[PDB]
Point group: D2
Chain length 389, copies 4
């Protein structure tokens, strides 16, 4: 019924690296223009831009509208941002699907975008500080990475999964290195070229073309993984080596009906058969993909074994192993081109990020059925089942 006619994403930049001073919407407009060009669709035909974003503070009125306009999307179309944390970028696509499936839109550019580098430090100063020190809060850590309920970092929820699923430090590091090695492999071999649209960083003493994911470590060893001290719990198991990073990027897909893509002579990246969002305990938020993937697979009518390829978001090696262990799919078809540990985790763009990687591999190796899924902070999961035409 509803298809992804085309897709694209920026390289994922490191924290204060390639896109340190690059606002989220500028990344988004580049990806909106890209999906338009790749599908052979004019921006004048786009009805609505839906972009997941978690940290828009200080970027001004509705960055989704700013991205759209700069992308040459007309003023008659509509745009908006949404926040389901890590799940946003993929949910935007599902929400984009719903627009078309209910007859409220024909063509929808959806996905997500995030500049964790440009998230500001903030403080409430309307009441006035008569006396005493006050905190300037990092919006990134407050609004993106710390649980609202139990007050600790997402890495502490990773510890709760690691201890519950008795996943050792050695098992988490081996998965970590495996992610880095696969991701260097898929990089050298050009397997990220299709999906990645170059982004021109507008400078002063020189522009810079970024078309390579700069967070991927090259020649990552097990020895350098085992020496790092625990990043959250000081007698724990999760580290900066086996957790995801702080990153900037954007990613999007162009949605339309299966009839509309056929009219236009477009051969789509895939057909969205079903999606699903489900909740879990915020203490073990890393177990989100388990019920959400299972819900999606139930809507699609598929069993776990029918999947040819899977993109399960690596938020932490503890939670990425747990999802894999519970669902029991073949690990050789999971994150075939590495995952978020190596590639990075631009919160709002992360779901649209892993949708690209899934769609292009499905096209490249001839996979029929595929699934994407991310764990979501606050204790939820989102999933989406794709079938190729």
């Amino acid at each position: 019924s509803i298809v992804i006619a085309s897709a694209a994403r920026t390289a994922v930049g490191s924290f204060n690296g390639a896109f340190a001073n690059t606002p989220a919407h500028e990344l988004g407009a580049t990806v909106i223009s890209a999906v338009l060009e790749r599908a052979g669709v004019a921006a004048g035909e786009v009805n609505e831009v839906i972009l997941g974003q978690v940290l828009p503070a200080g970027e001004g009125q509705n960055p989704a509208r700013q991205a759209a306009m700069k992308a040459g999307v007309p003023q008659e179309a509509t745009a908006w941002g949404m926040n389901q944390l890590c799940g946003s970028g993929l949910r935007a696509v599902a929400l984009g699907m719903q627009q078309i499936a209910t007859g409220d839109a024909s063509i929808i550019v959806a996905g997500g975008m995030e500049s964790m580098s440009m998230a500001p430090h903030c403080a409430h100063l309307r009441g006035g500080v008569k006396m005493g020190d006050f905190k300037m809060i990092d919006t990134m850590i407050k609004d993106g990475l710390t649980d609202a309920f139990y007050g600790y970092h997402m890495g502490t929820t990773a510890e709760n999964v690691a201890k519950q699923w008795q996943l050792s430090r050695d098992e988490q590091d081996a998965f970590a290195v495996a992610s880095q090695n696969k991701a260097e492999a898929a990089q050298k071999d050009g397997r990220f070229k299709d999906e990645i649209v170059p982004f021109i960083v507008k400078g002063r003493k020189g522009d810079i073309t970024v078309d390579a994911d700069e967070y991927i470590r090259h020649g990552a060893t097990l020895d350098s993984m085992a020496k790092l001290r625990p990043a959250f719990d000081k007698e724990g198991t999760v580290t900066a080596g086996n957790a995801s990073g702080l990153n900037d990027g954007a990613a999007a897909a162009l949605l339309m009906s299966e009839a509309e893509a056929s009219r236009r002579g477009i051969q789509p990246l895939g057909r969205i058969v079903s999606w699903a969002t489900v909740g879990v305990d915020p203490k073990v938020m890393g177990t989100g993909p388990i019920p959400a993937s299972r819900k999606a697979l139930e809507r699609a009518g598929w069993k776990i074994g029918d999947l040819d390829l899977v993109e399960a978001n690596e938020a932490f090696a503890a939670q990425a192993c747990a999802v894999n262990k519970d669902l029991g799919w073949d690990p050789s078809i999971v994150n075939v081109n590495g995952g978020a540990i190596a590639i990075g985790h631009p919160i709002g763009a992360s779901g649209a990020r892993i949708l690209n990687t899934l769609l292009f591999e499905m096209k490249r190796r001839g996979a029929r059925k595929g699934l994407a899924t991310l764990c979501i902070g606050g204790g939820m999961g989102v999933a989406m089942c794709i079938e190729s035409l």
Copy 2:
């Protein structure tokens, strides 16, 4: 097909007034609890909570999810935030409608919440300020009230509609006083009692029940309206009197299928017959309701005359007159209980705010057909058509 079984909202509080230190998500949870109680539905049955919010900076991971949890909605359900500026609150309800219509949920608590008082000041300070003065930005003005393209306050876009539609200073003031007078009459008569749910402001030396809209001025004269200097263009026409304020509040609805509401013995507030969202030039953003209501009316198969009641969001007196003048509906059925000039304009909650007034008046006077609509910053407009059962 899809119905609002029940609804509720907090009193709209002034800037740094009744809810000066009350985070949005607390206001949201009360409204969730209210809509659950008023329908006779347990929090356990709620599949998702979709909350429009514009200024969540500093409030922590996904305030929609915080609102839900504190409301007693279980961990299995889902929750997310979205931003289409003023139109966020009403677009939550259409998006919540879409979930049910597409068979992805059975019950949805949609609406919006806003704490403008708690919107922090910010600045991006990762790079370091090697030397010189910097600016601490007001995330309320920047992210909520300033246009991202031309750089000015929304009041200057109200000046562009005033000069284009040649609406004099005297016409706008008259409309400003009429909104205040209508809203005081509805307040004294208890017409806001149904929709408003009391909110307990948790104090230290005494709690405070807020169940009255404290921004409504009592005994508003034309003379105090005509003495205020222009707020934006110093030789212009728009003022603090004829413009909307900065306000806190929350508003929500409980959505389910028409058959489900019949199963549960619930007599709904109304049936959502259509909606629509459209774009226009950001310079004349106030005109958003003109094409958006026209589209909505076209999707419902209705003519403008068929409407028995209308809520057109008074962002400014210049734009409120323009929409009424273009569409040409009988002005005696528009904002009958007053509007945003008098009541307030909590950005994210405003679309859910005006929905509640429409629904409870439609029920109280026996209006069959009704329409709600808001103008959106960045240059857009949303509209929803409601028919009672």
Copy 3:
């Protein structure tokens, strides 16, 4: 040898009260102008202005220079600021004396000034805050009121003196009340009128003449002294009642040689017979006056019993009691017009503030010999012996 030909001071203002927005150097100039007028000396004749100030941050290059210039003191003269914390106001005068004593100056204006109200909040942001919350620090508490070594507030030092000298809560409160009552009586009787020079608070909707010390409480009860909880040690004895306050003010003296006064027909307020400064352990910094006063007396050739009036600064009741107890002078001739608990403690001015009160009482009651002394943070004291001609 050297005499104080004239002196003046502003009413001491409350924290964020009369002088809330009045920069320190404006108060300093008013007082500079005053001592010139009161001695019959033209600003043209002034060689240098020396002003103790502790919290000048954000006021600009060298507030002392700004003070002098606005007083009409000519550009050919020189001016500077100095910081020895609480001692700074009185040490300036001893420093002024030394300029004249060594032939480097004929006419010196010396004293101090302080706007604790206008002390700003600060933070070091040049390196950049890559990630995580940071503190905006209160320069008033950081640079004025916290010990640099042991890291606690001056009130905790006050507790160290309380316990070492076994001074009860009851003893501190009575003293606190005795200061307030003496101070109110001296106010009502007009005894502050000679020393105070009115200050014109330049407003916008009306100027305001401040010439009554506003922090002096009227009708202070022992019962309201007994009920306050301890401000520093939550099981301690020092409170906001028995400690000094946070205040604004300036004060200054006009120095020249005894021969020079006689040439001009001036009858001086006093002859500066000696001064001293001495150090003690910072834990017990309130004990500064004990060895300082003793030293000054030894340099003067005077015994303690030869003094007719004393102004021993009340930073805290605990230390104030200790100094009296150790030195053993007649308490009926100490802070006869009340003290800093009642009057205020504008850190940098405080030493000139107490000189004024000493000098004008000595003239009024015909005391021949007098002594002024303040305890200093970081463990120091300063004393100065005055004799009348």
Copy 4:
């Protein structure tokens, strides 16, 4: 009568260079320790530490005291800071000379210190910012570099002198280049080794001994001087090239009577024969040294031509050329080892900085008579005359 028994100064570090994160009081303690060590005098015997500092904001109660204590100077001794801008560091020595000459002290450690790197940004936020943006002020620019009266940077004052004394862009550059080259030669030859005491920068992944002035440029060309744009007046003549810099450092000298040195077996660096400070128009503040040196030479009984070495601080090439031009001393005996354009300008330390270089070259070449002088912001100068025993 009074002599300098010993002296010492840190390397002067670049803005956010070697001491980027080193509080001024750590630099002042190393220099206190040094001057004690170098005279054969124990901290125990030090009566007082007097340190000029202009930007102590955020460092805590009285850095002078903190420096002294860290240096091992005992709690019985006393300590304070003063501010006369660029003059601060040298006036401390004159103020130290006065303590001994009037019998109030026997041994004084005096001089200055400054960490411009660590100067914080501040804002006055007690009243509450109700609404709108506010400025975070750079204390270094506001409180150290901008003129309080006319509101412009010190550099603009430099232009007034350039225009008044008709000093061309070419003449300023040649002077600028010549300071660099003379300073590189002295550096390479070890001529700064005597005066400099190494400073251990405590780190975490290593300590660092800084004992070389890092701001000195090597192989400076006239060409690169000519290409720079005017830093202040955009059609002006003064640049970053020919202006001094922003710098960190400390410097100190140890004073005692000539007899006291004779008793201790010490051979002093020099006798202080006179000093002076004088005022001029703030507009042309760079002319400060002219009347201050003239005054100084008069009190000494010396004509200008008697001087064998001179250290005339280089705040700006324009002013430096002015002072040399007006006073007419042999330019070959002035700043013989280079100056502030090359070495840097740690505002509060600078006057002691230049004392050191004067003192150690007078010893090394056998100059009998010498003179140091600095121009001072707000419109003043200071000068000190030194003779060798």
